[PDB]
Amino acid sequence: MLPNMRSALKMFEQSVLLKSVETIRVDFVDDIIITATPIRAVVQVADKKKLNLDSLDWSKQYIWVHSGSKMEIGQFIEWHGKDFKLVAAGDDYSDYGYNAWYGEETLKPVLVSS
Amino acid sequence: SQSIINVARYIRDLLDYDENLIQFDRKNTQQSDTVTGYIVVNGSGVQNVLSHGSSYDGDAEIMEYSKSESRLITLEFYGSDAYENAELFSLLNQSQKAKEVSRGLGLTIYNVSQATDVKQLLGYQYGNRVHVDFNIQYCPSVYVETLRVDASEFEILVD
Numbered sequence: 001m002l003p004n005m006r007s008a009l010k011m012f013e014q015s016v017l018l019k020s021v022e023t024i025r026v027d028f029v030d031d032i033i034i035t036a037t038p039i040r041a042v043v044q045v046a047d048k049k050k051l052n053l054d055s056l057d058w059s060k061q062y063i064w065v066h067s068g069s070k071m072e073i074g075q076f077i078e079w080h081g082k083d084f085k086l087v088a089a090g091d092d093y094s095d096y097g098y099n100a101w102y103g104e105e106t107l108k109p110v111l112v113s114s
Numbered sequence: 115s116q117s118i119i120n121v122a123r124y125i126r127d128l129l130d131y132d133e134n135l136i137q138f139d140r141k142n143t144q145q146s147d148t149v150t151g152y153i154v155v156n157g158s159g160v161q162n163v164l165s166h167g168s169s170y171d172g173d174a175e176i177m178e179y180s181k182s183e184s185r186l187i188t189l190e191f192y193g194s195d196a197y198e199n200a201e202l203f204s205l206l207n208q209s210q211k212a213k214e215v216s217r218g219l220g221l222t223i224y225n226v227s228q229a230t231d232v233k234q235l236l237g238y239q240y241g242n243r244v245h246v247d248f249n250i251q252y253c254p255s256v257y258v259e260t261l262r263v264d265a266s267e268f269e270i271l272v273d
Contacts, residue, residue: 025133028119028126074144 004097012042020075041067046102063103083110117252118157120219128212148241151193161185176259184251196242221252
């Protein structure tokens with residue numbers, strides 16, 4: 001019997017939107033439909049969000065979510081005001097009943113429907 | 115602007131090759147299923163200008179600021195059939211098909227300069243990846259509504 005952290009994930013839940021992009025192109029012109037779903041999750045900070053140095057300073061908040069629902073990389077997660085690309089340090093205890101990912105705020109505005 | 119997309123067009127229908135399988139460059143795009151031989155028009159090479167034209171039109175009176183330039187755009191082929199899509203491109207580049215399909219793509223096309231089978235470190239594995247080089251030369255333009263001079267009144271003086 002595979003251990004299932006699922007029940008150990010409900011208490012800490014939070015509502016959040018999980019979107020994915022399925023890019024569409026004709027004659028090499030970019031359009032992006034969206035797929036958004038209300039999914040369960042839990043959020044903690046992932047890399048303490050610092051200020052990098054460049055020609056202009058920039059900063060991207062990091063969150064790392066858990067959920068009972070599967071989360072592929074090429075998906076975004078919005079919880080407060082800015083979606084996070086599910087890019088890094090993710091791991092799928094799918095057979096153990098959940099999965100986790102870090103998150104990168106796409107400083108672009110949130111993909112509502114396009 | 116449009117130049118990289120144009121060379122992407124040219125490689126799109128020189129190899130008779132797919133839309134969704136040509137991605138541009140160092141953008142964000144996932145390369146899933148390594149064997150799906152992709153082609154990417156790497157434009158990271160510095161584009162350097164050559165001249166800055168300036169033409170002027172009389173009747174439908176506006177003028178025309180042009181800027182000829184060139185960039186060493188490289189092509190990276192991926193996938194199990196990378197080698198072929200390299201060579202078969204690196205050799206059809208100077209045929210009828212290419213030189214006949216790049217009609218309106220306001221973009222010259224020079225010979226393929228060099229190739230390389232530099233693969234990519236796909237994490238304890240090697241995925242086929244080949245670069246081919248060729249300088250590409252084009253010229254963006256813009257049009258501006260200036261206005262002509264119809265006459266010139268003036269006065270002279272003398273000792």
